[PDB]
Design an enzyme around this catalytic site. Structure first.
Site, PDB file in Angstrom:
ATOM      1  N   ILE B  12       0.836  -1.199   0.000  1.00 42.70           N
ATOM      2  CA  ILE B  12       0.000   0.000   0.000  1.00 42.70           C
ATOM      3  C   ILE B  12       0.872   1.251   0.000  1.00 42.70           C
ATOM      4  O   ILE B  12       0.559   2.239  -0.673  1.00 42.70           O
ATOM      5  CB  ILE B  12      -0.990  -0.012   1.182  1.00 42.70           C
ATOM      6  CG1 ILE B  12      -1.853   1.248   1.159  1.00 42.70           C
ATOM      7  CG2 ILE B  12      -0.279  -0.071   2.516  1.00 42.70           C
ATOM      8  CD1 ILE B  12      -2.990   1.155   0.198  1.00 42.70           C
ATOM      9  N   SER B  34      11.805   0.709   6.799  1.00 35.99           N
ATOM     10  CA  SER B  34      11.202  -0.593   6.585  1.00 35.99           C
ATOM     11  C   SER B  34      12.283  -1.638   6.782  1.00 35.99           C
ATOM     12  O   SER B  34      13.465  -1.367   6.545  1.00 35.99           O
ATOM     13  CB  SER B  34      10.612  -0.711   5.181  1.00 35.99           C
ATOM     14  OG  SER B  34      10.702  -2.046   4.728  1.00 35.99           O
ATOM     15  N   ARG B  35      11.878  -2.826   7.224  1.00 35.39           N
ATOM     16  CA  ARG B  35      12.842  -3.915   7.302  1.00 35.39           C
ATOM     17  C   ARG B  35      13.043  -4.618   5.969  1.00 35.39           C
ATOM     18  O   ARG B  35      13.928  -5.473   5.864  1.00 35.39           O
ATOM     19  CB  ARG B  35      12.416  -4.943   8.351  1.00 35.39           C
ATOM     20  CG  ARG B  35      12.727  -4.552   9.779  1.00 35.39           C
ATOM     21  CD  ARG B  35      11.638  -5.086  10.698  1.00 35.39           C
ATOM     22  NE  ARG B  35      11.835  -4.732  12.099  1.00 35.39           N
ATOM     23  CZ  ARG B  35      11.804  -3.493  12.580  1.00 35.39           C
ATOM     24  NH1 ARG B  35      11.601  -2.457  11.777  1.00 35.39           N
ATOM     25  NH2 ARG B  35      11.975  -3.290  13.874  1.00 35.39           N
ATOM     26  N   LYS B  88      -5.342   3.822   8.606  1.00 34.24           N
ATOM     27  CA  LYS B  88      -6.400   3.252   9.421  1.00 34.24           C
ATOM     28  C   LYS B  88      -6.128   1.774   9.694  1.00 34.24           C
ATOM     29  O   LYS B  88      -5.409   1.114   8.932  1.00 34.24           O
ATOM     30  CB  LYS B  88      -7.776   3.445   8.745  1.00 34.24           C
ATOM     31  CG  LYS B  88      -7.935   3.006   7.274  1.00 34.24           C
ATOM     32  CD  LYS B  88      -8.137   1.529   7.195  1.00 34.24           C
ATOM     33  CE  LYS B  88      -9.110   1.065   6.212  1.00 34.24           C
ATOM     34  NZ  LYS B  88      -9.090  -0.404   6.198  1.00 34.24           N
ATOM     35  N   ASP B 166     -10.977  -5.048   8.650  1.00 35.94           N
ATOM     36  CA  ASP B 166      -9.984  -4.257   7.930  1.00 35.94           C
ATOM     37  C   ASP B 166     -10.648  -3.535   6.763  1.00 35.94           C
ATOM     38  O   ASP B 166     -10.718  -2.291   6.792  1.00 35.94           O
ATOM     39  CB  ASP B 166      -8.790  -5.168   7.568  1.00 35.94           C
ATOM     40  CG  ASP B 166      -7.910  -4.613   6.456  1.00 35.94           C
ATOM     41  OD1 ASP B 166      -7.896  -3.390   6.226  1.00 35.94           O
ATOM     42  OD2 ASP B 166      -7.203  -5.424   5.808  1.00 35.94           O
TER      43      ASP B 166
END
EC number: 1.1.1.376
Lengths: 307, 306
Positions: B12, B34-35, B88, B166
């Site tokens: 996303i 980010s990993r 969200k 979700d």
């Protein structure tokens, strides 16, 4: 200044705690009751709240003592009919319903009082004052009782919206949120749910306040070796220990003398004062923490309870 | 220009956030954390702690990771003096969002709980039409195959991951924006596969404060029809939102809409909130989901297979 009062839901809490407290409070006149159980002596009786409201137009206030799953419809009808409203805990089965009731009461100029009887236990205010200015290190809650001893034959506790072990556990949370100076965030929860019920019989909460103080809680309704209703707060000035559900207090190892237990007399006195001052009192934070546990908590099935 | 860090670079972020940011000159994409793989053309970090320590001048962060890590991330960003935009849901719990809002207000920082579906092009026209009208009933149908639309995702099945709520909370974020009165949950049923922690299907029975029935069906199981629909019956006809908010009809007539640009609209609003020194934290969609998890009846179903 006497407030005429109706009581809705004549179960054991009403008969054991509410009616004795009301009858000893001069500021109220017990006028009407509504339930589907035995007629109450000395008042006008109804089998539902709709009938009570239709026949008691002059009545000033109602106190709602039925299970939380019917609380919203009853409180809404009472507010719509023009009555002040006192709520047993939890103030609703959901948070949205309590927000709507508070808004409706405010718009109509009526008192709404979400009660938390355990907040009126004698140790709570001395503990709150002692902890206000002090460096807190950790909090541990242990709230354990055999549901078969303390809630024999109750069924609403096992139905959706009935809280299960959070029925007594939210009492502990109502004390914790009153005595601690900072708000709590739930970081993890585990809910143990018997296969034949809808609510937990045991739960563990791992919380932190906004300074990072760890606040841990264990609630258990299963039979165990000890029944206990304890809140321990570790500080740089010693341990504050609440026990007996708020009726016993020690500070840094020393017992603290307390006033006698009068939780429901204190609740009705405050309800009368709220009405007199044109105010409401709706603290949902204990219910918000329980909602967070049901939303975020890991659920573990266990063997059937047997209902 | 507001210098911006993005935290959590999944699909996303790669497909919606970065394109929206790069097309908005009001922001300068400066850092990512980010990993996973490094992002090209910015400074990259493996975690937010390292990003914050190395980017003291940074103005704002946008959090795109799963909600179970959002409180710790947003708190660290606010403590470091950054404005914060939240995907969200804004938290895994309601208490954490209240704490973040109070912290942001105490520090004089912008906190923005986003609801991308509230920026779908049907939403504002629907809200204005319904503002002064007699509403009779509301029906929500939000059904999609999870294996198509969220392939290989695991956080959705873990505690605090919402399951079918979700996408369902997107529908609730539209409903709570277009309807003039607040909603109370009267009944919910949650269908939970035996190998997950969150529901794969749910039904909600709600009422607004005038007693209007508001019913919702959410389903992530494979079915004959995928649909993202909200229908509001009124004395003046049916208002019908479809395609997740990208299509609108009113009283049987189609309504022209502006371009579908949910995330561009979100970032524009974040910029405006920062510029005006304001926060925007509407938790009502999450409160309704919390009420469903608190009050809803749970029914076990067969294993999903993960």
């Amino acid at each position: 200044d006497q407030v005429s009062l109706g009581v809705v839901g004549i179960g054991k809490i009403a008969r054991d705690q509410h009616l004795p407290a009301i009858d000893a409070e001069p500021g109220f006149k017990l006028t009407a009751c509504a339930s589907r159980h035995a007629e109450v002596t000395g008042v006008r009786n109804y089998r539902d709240l709709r009938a009570l409201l239709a026949a008691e137009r002059e009545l000033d206030a109602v106190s709602l003592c039925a299970p939380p799953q019917v609380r919203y419809a009853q409180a809404r009808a009472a507010l719509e009919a023009g009555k002040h409203v006192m709520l047993e805990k939890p103030p609703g089965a959901t948070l949205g319903e309590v927000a709507v009731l508070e808004a409706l009461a405010r718009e109509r100029g009526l008192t709404l009082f979400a009660t938390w009887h355990s907040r009126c236990a004698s140790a709570v205010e001395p503990a709150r004052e002692w902890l206000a200015t002090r460096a807190i290190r950790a909090v541990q809650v242990r709230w354990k009782e055999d549901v078969r001893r303390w809630h024999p034959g109750q069924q609403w506790i096992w139905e959706p919206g009935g809280l299960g072990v959070f029925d007594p556990g939210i009492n502990a949370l109502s004390i914790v949120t009153r005595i601690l100076p900072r708000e709590l965030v739930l970081r993890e929860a585990t809910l143990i749910v018997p296969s034949d019920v809808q609510t937990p019989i045991a739960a563990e909460l791992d919380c932190a306040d906004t300074d990072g103080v760890p606040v841990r809680a264990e609630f258990d309704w299963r039979h165990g070796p000890v029944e206990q209703w304890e809140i321990a707060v570790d500080t740089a000035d010693g341990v504050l220990a609440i026990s007996r559900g708020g009726a016993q207090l020690s500070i840094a190892g020393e017992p603290v003398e307390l006033g006698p237990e009068r939780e429901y007399p204190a609740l009705y006195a405050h309800f009368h004062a709220l009405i007199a001052r044109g105010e409401s009192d709706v603290d949902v934070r204990p219910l918000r923490l329980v909602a967070d546990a049901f939303l975020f908590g890991r659920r573990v099935q266990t063997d059937a309870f047997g209902r």
